[PDB]
Amino acid sequence: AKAKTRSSRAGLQFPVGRVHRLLRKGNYAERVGAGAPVYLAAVLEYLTAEILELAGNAARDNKKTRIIPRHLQLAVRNDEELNKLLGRVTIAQGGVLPNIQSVLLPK
Amino acid sequence: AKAKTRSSRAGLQFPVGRVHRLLRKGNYAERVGAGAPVYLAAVLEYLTAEILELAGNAARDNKKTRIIPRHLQLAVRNDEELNKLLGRVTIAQGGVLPNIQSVLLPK
Amino acid sequence: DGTLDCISMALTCTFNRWGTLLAVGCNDGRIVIWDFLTRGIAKIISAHIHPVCSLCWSRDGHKLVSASTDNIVSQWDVLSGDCDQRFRFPSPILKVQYHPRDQNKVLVCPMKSAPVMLTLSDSKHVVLPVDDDSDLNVVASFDRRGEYIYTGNAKGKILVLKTDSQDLVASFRVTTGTSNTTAIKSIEFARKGSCFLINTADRIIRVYDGREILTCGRDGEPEPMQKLQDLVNRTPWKKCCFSGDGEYIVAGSARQHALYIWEKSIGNLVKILHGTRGELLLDVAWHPVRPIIASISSGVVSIWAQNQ
Amino acid sequence: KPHRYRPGTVALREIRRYQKSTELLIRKLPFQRLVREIAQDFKTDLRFQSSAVMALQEASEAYLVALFEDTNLCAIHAKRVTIMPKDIQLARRIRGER
Amino acid sequence: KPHRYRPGTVALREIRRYQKSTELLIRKLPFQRLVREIAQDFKTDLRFQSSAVMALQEASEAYLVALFEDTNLCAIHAKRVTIMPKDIQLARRIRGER
Amino acid sequence: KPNYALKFTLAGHTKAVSSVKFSPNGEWLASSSADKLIKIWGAYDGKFEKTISGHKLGISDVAWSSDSNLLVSASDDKTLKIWDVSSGKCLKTLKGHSNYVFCCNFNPQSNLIVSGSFDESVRIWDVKTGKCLKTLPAHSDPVSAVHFNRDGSLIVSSSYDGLCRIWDTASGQCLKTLIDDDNPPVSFVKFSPNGKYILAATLDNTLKLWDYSKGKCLKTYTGHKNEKYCIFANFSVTGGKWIVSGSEDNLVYIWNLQTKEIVQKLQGHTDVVISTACHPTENIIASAALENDKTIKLWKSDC
Amino acid sequence: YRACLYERVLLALHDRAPQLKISDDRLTVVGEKGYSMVRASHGVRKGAWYFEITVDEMPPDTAARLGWSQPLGNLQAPLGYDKFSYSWRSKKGTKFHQSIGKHYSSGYGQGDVLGFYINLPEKQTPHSEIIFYKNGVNQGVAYKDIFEGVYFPAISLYKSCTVSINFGPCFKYPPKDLTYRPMSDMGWGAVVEHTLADVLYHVEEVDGRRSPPWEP
Amino acid sequence: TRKESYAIYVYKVLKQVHPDTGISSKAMSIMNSFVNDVFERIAGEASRLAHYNKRSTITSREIQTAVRLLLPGELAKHAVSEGTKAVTKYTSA
Amino acid sequence: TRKESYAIYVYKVLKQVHPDTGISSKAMSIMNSFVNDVFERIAGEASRLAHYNKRSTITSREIQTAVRLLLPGELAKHAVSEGTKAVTKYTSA
Amino acid sequence: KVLRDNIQGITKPAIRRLARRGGVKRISGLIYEETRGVLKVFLENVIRDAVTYTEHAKRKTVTAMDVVYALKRQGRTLYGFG
Amino acid sequence: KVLRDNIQGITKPAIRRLARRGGVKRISGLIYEETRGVLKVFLENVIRDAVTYTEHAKRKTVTAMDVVYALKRQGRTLYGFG
Amino acid sequence: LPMPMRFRHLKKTSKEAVGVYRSPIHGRGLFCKRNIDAGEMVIEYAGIVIRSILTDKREKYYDSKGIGCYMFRIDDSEVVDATMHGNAARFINHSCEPNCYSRVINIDGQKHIVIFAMRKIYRGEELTYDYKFPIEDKLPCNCGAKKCRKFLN
DNA sequence: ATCGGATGTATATATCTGACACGTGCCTGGAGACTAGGGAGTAATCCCCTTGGCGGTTAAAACGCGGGGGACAGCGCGTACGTGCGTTTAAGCGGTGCTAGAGCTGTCTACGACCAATTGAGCGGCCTCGGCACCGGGATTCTCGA
DNA sequence: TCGAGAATCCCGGTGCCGAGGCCGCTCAATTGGTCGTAGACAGCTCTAGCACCGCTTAAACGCACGTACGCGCTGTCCCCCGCGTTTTAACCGCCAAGGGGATTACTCCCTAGTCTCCAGGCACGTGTCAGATATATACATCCGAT
């Protein structure tokens, strides 16, 4: 009996075994549903895809292959729903997305 | 088979057995420290004492036997430590403590 | 608060034992001994062609030790003005100091070399020890009675020797708070009691009681009686001195030509005196038995009294 | 001759009595209708507890008086006794509500 | 004749390059000494990770630029380009920091 | 008790003598009078040393220097005059008192002068430049006597208005004002040798020793007669502790210092014994009488 | 303003000697050496009025004196040493004035609650008099000859005397006269009068002054 | 359906502090909700810490530490004392 | 010490979306911390709602509901659809 | 029974009453509707999240404990409702 | 080794650098020390709470994960440190 | 500004704000050396604070000594007697048109009689206030004012 | 700055009551007693990060130094907002009545729990090399006086 | 306003180490039984919600109107920006000691889990007074004339 990872049968990239391990070790319920780690890991993969895509957009806009935290912070403050999700979150080497106020301009 | 509850064994009021069952059903840790319910319930006893005491202070300050939630709001807004404890907390029928800004007064 | 037009090129001054006369050095290298009561010059001595940067009275007041910028030290009788003795060294002299209880002896702090204690009777000299052997800048001073010698290096190390044997009777290094040393700018003592002060490169004056250093022993952690500074401007101190009694301390802000006055016990700032914003503050001294303070700035002396 | 109190004075006393009072200052039924209108947007024909909607209105009004409060404060920093929409907007901005 | 840019202009470019840059703007050692000074208040002779203190300073500076940001915004609502302490205080007030 | 006997009688002032003072070394006796003349005499033999003139009007007071080298002369010409006692040279002439100068005294360090005048203002003077450094509306009546404390920190002043006022020297601050329940015209005042007490004569045949720290009269001395003239009082210390003074009855009164009782009455003067001086070292007392006597008498006792 | 640090009209602390101690538990007054004098807050200028003194301690070497005194009364003197003070010595009832003692009086008791009646008109002041009572019982007239000038009730202490002044609404044996006024009444009368004095002096700020038909 | 609460206990401690002062049911349920909230606060915090310690057991030391984290200054101090008292009183059982 | 992370799966899904891109290890750690954050968020919310439902079993319905509670609009919609498709795929075998 | 426009059912007198409670003296008109919007936006979240709870609750009526856990999750917790 | 007064070790140039990063043109002096205070106050919490963690950690050195969980509990979470 | 703070400022600036010179009013008097604004503290009439009952005993005392009485009524209970101990305020002449006015202030429980400026007083001006002396039976006034009562009393 | 009048507000009173304190019978969670395992605690070991110091540099901080720029104070006006009084209006009481849906019990069953046997996906560790960071230099563009 | 000058952008070239790729080397993931049980679901209540409708009225909307703060503009001061210089200590690189952090291996104290019994808690009735409410009253305070 060959052993394949459950994420393969889920066709995903993040290790659902490690997921369910953290789940049981997380003291959330007496017994975790079978497909619940699968579902949440799928959500995780999707959102990671979104954020990494935004980051790659920013970096290539800046003509950069290696993506520095600044790109990610900029994308964060560029996605309104993601920002809402993460506005309460602080970002190392984030800096501030360029924001210029009106009355600040000269004449 | 002499009976004596752990609250009496601590000479306190909050139900050590009940809160122990509660934390057990709360799924936070596999095993528990038997004295942790005692300790926490004692802390609750203390803080409850202070807050109800300030509440009653406002109450008889208003000739009020039965304490009103407005007394509670005033109490929690007066004490710095308790206010800090419950800053982002809201209270039903709370209202706002008396506060008029300086420039609000006409000269 | 009162200046003197009759003297020019004021560079360094020194009160006599009773605060009756003031010997001020001039750029021409002359001693102008000016009197407080008659409010006039009492004597003019052709000391050096080189300006005088260090001046000290004798206990009897009949002798004054002077140091030229030509590395020329000379003793002069105040009545006659003759050069009683004259010596010269390498590493130009930073300071001279009569021994308070033996005017025959005088300590000398040179620029690059260790301070040496000479006698006038015999032209001998005793080189005082140096802890780190590489300070090249150590200020030194007798205590109030001349029983011990306090030497502070550019590396915050403080040695207390006995004046006769030069033996290390106490030691400790002052700190910049965190872990660092600071250049000991100067060591001053009180003419009354045992409290003394240290001016350091951190612009922070540290007041101690020498008995506490003596009981602290060698290589100890003696805390200061007081810590004094301009927390507002963070100003260096070109020259500081106690009061005559020893309960008031003054510092000269040459950065802005001002004078800060704190207490000893509490340490709170008594007051501030503001001089000419264009004057560069150079020298500071207190009347030993009066609330009178002499200041030398841009070659001009000013007097600051305090009335009832 | 008819008397009229100087401006604000009546409103000042209103402030005083409102900090004195503690009950709600919103009519129940309009608030409830608004809540149900909002509800049908996400799903239609949903029922509610009177306790639930009382909680909604109380918590709302609390947030609202807090907003009015700190916007008053900001307007103090704006050196005005009149309120400006920008005050509310920037308050939410500092409140992370933007 | 000597040239001097008009006020703010140089500071404006500084703003531009700082929004351009991302690294820290605080000298490491002073911040670290401050942290250890604060630490000895609660308990003396406690050690730290360089990573830990780097996190401290980064997170601080983040909170600090956020405070500067929304206080700038408030000062816009204050119709001034100069900052006033009351702006910061009331900002914390809206930030629930009072 | 003293046994002062007349040893030398001195005279020569053409007018009423106003003051006689022993030199601090006890070598000379300076006698001032209204004749615009001062007379230095030998303090042990009654030998007339010399006469120093130069003042334009009558002289109301003269005071020695501490080193026995200078003499300040306060004259009715509204002027002081500082003289070298050895050369008799008018080293300085102090102008600025608007009326008759009546008293004058050096500081304990001899470098400063206090002066009282009819102008009812006390002037404070330099010695080496002779410059008036301070001027105080001290009293509401012409000043009678001014004097320094032991060190020169305090200046006591008396005047005809009956006030005895202690003033700060460095500031002119009116430190104290001694009152004795009445307004007795105080014609003389001076500090105690220890600077702890003050002897003041009032023009009612009464002398009063006050404590300075207490501000109250400690002792009183009567039996003499003094109601119009500036009769001087001195502390006899070279022998027993006594209080010596003149009197309008031609007597030279000597009371015990502590018991306040008269310990001697030197008679032989024919006019009011106007001025008195006690020797600093010996038991010698110079008593000078007024114009109906014009004589100064040396008295020597054995204790 | 002349605001007085007093809940009721009491013995004014502004007019006591430095050797005069008070206990506000009974507002009693006591001393240590010799005699001294204290006075009340109020002062009579016209009409008839009445107060009391309650004695709480009278050892043999303890003799208080109680009466009235006009200003010019040196508060170190024993309340009757001058001609402006008229008191009673609390050893035997003896009227003391000009330091002169007169036995035209009754006898005093150690625990006497003594009533003090005094009537000044609106060179003796016409029809003015002083009457002394022992617990309301008439001890008799003390002084008919009363000089001009305002008077105030005063207490003199000898070595460690304990006595206290007391007003009318808490009295023990009060006269039922409708004209006499307690201590508190004249007290607030004088307080209001001095309030108006401040008013009028600050007015004298504005040009002009004007007062009604003089009689009152 | 039995619904547990602490109105009994809050009333007990009320009397223990104020036998005279009464209580309203509204404020009663307020107290109950509040204590539930703060108990969940301390529970989550202590569990988080122990997870950091990776210790599957939750003991009193965790409670002390986490309430110290929770309470503003002196409260905690006071608090911990009685807590200690409690366990002492219970360890002395 | 065996420490577990997800940066390998980060690189995987990156290549899945951007094959020609590199990352800063710093950014990888940031993203992994973000993963942990969202995971604890969703887990806590699910446990809390199950507690409200008194459920001791956290299943995919809880997952979807809690995501909807957390994610906004089309984010939530797409995430729900994706989790649904994935659990369908896994349940298909 | 399709509802609408109850937002303006919020009376300007009600708004100014709340403002006076907040200690406000002078107010402009432009606020109220703006205010209303915010109000809406604010509640815009909670009810949804609340019914989201009710979503998982599989129930047709909405309860207080829903908004309790919402305000909790919204960091604006409230007391007095279990 | 007792430390002190490193708060003023924060240079005004550093403060204005941070301000320019925040996009600020004109600044007053009164801010900086005030600023500093806030800074202190801010960190005043975290370190303590952090060492509180270290308190329960029973360790002498302080780690990043401490401040991580603090800022988390302080609702100011940060990434990039495990 | 606080009456204590204002009083500290007044006692700090009094020595350099005013002077005493020969006066055309009479003898010597107080002149302004630096422009004084209206209502601001000009000078304290500092002296010996005594009770009222002790006034006469002092006055007669001075009457026995021929020394003039320098006393100002603080109130019905206190008086600042500056006869023997005072300050420069003993040289403030009177004018029927005063640019100054006396007021009693309470600092830390003690009363101070401060002459404030009725108007903006400029440098060189002689300082005068209303003594408000009651009408006697006569001191002629030479204040120079056109409204001068010809008599203080 | 005051007084008079208007008005609004704190008080005492009376009674009504419905929450509310109080007591019950009955239930089950808590206590009490007993068993196991194994998380926790202790200890010896290793490592190794940290904390300490030392010397040279300069970019950075301190400090000074005009000086234009705006903070601010004041000053006119006017429009927008309190207010008190009108008006009309839904809000609230309340009470009715239906049931849809919570809300409860009773199954039974699929479903992880769990353990055991198996291992390859993944992770620490080791090369490696190329975007990337730095640098120098040239060309571009903003800005401040015409 | 067209140049001078200055800060910047970009280009080529240099050298590097982190990003990455691959390699041993597991333990944690998978697989497969097996079991007790969470809840899925059905099937009942009942009640709280939902709507109906009427009656009263406090409340809401709008008006008119004074008015007064918002706003807009001017001139001043001072003061913070910009640049120049001087001083310094952060940094950086290296070294070194040890002290704590992490590890592993035992060891066992304590807690989970079980079973028993009951007693405190809880739903449920039950009088009953704290206070809600209304009213007349006495006090406080604004607003305008003086």
Author numbering:
A (entry chain M), B (entry chain I): 12 to 118
C (entry chain A): 18 to 325
D (entry chain K), E (entry chain G): 37 to 134
F (entry chain B): 32 to 334
G (entry chain D): 279 to 400, 440 to 521, 523 to 534
H (entry chain J), I (entry chain N): 29 to 121
J (entry chain L), K (entry chain H): 20 to 101
L (entry chain C): 3814 to 3950, 3954 to 3969
What does the publication say?
To understand the molecular mechanism by which DPY30 regulates MLL1 activity on the NCP, we determined the single-particle cryo-EM structure of the human recombinant MLL1RWSA complex (4-MLL1), containing four of the five core proteins, i.e. RbBP5 (aa 1–538); WDR5 (aa 22–334); MLL1SET (aa 3762–3969); and ASH2LΔSDI (aa 1–504), bound to the NCP (4-MLL1-NCP). After several rounds of heterogeneous refinement using cryoSPARC57, we isolated four different subclasses of 4-MLL1-NCP (Class01, 02, 03, and 05). In the end, we obtained three different subclasses of 4-MLL1-NCP structures (Class 01, 02, and 05). While the majority of the 5-MLL1-NCP complexes anchored on the NCP with RbBP5 and ASH2L at DNA SHL 1.5 and 7, respectively, the 4-MLL1-NCP complex adopted multiple modes of interaction. Furthermore, local ASH2L binding dynamics on the NCP also increased significantly in the absence of DPY30, as demonstrated by extremely low or complete loss of ASH2L IDR density in a significant subset of the structures.
We and others have previously shown that these core components are essential for MLL1 catalytic activity on histone H327–29. Compared to the well-studied WDR5, RbBP5, and ASH2LSPRY proteins, the function of DPY30 and the extended intrinsically disordered regions (IDRs) of ASH2L in the MLL1 complex remains a mystery. By combined NMR, SAXS, cryo-EM and biochemical approaches, we find that DPY30 functions through the extended IDRs of ASH2L to restrict the rotational dynamics of the MLL1 complex on the NCP, thereby promoting H3K4 methylation at higher methylation states.
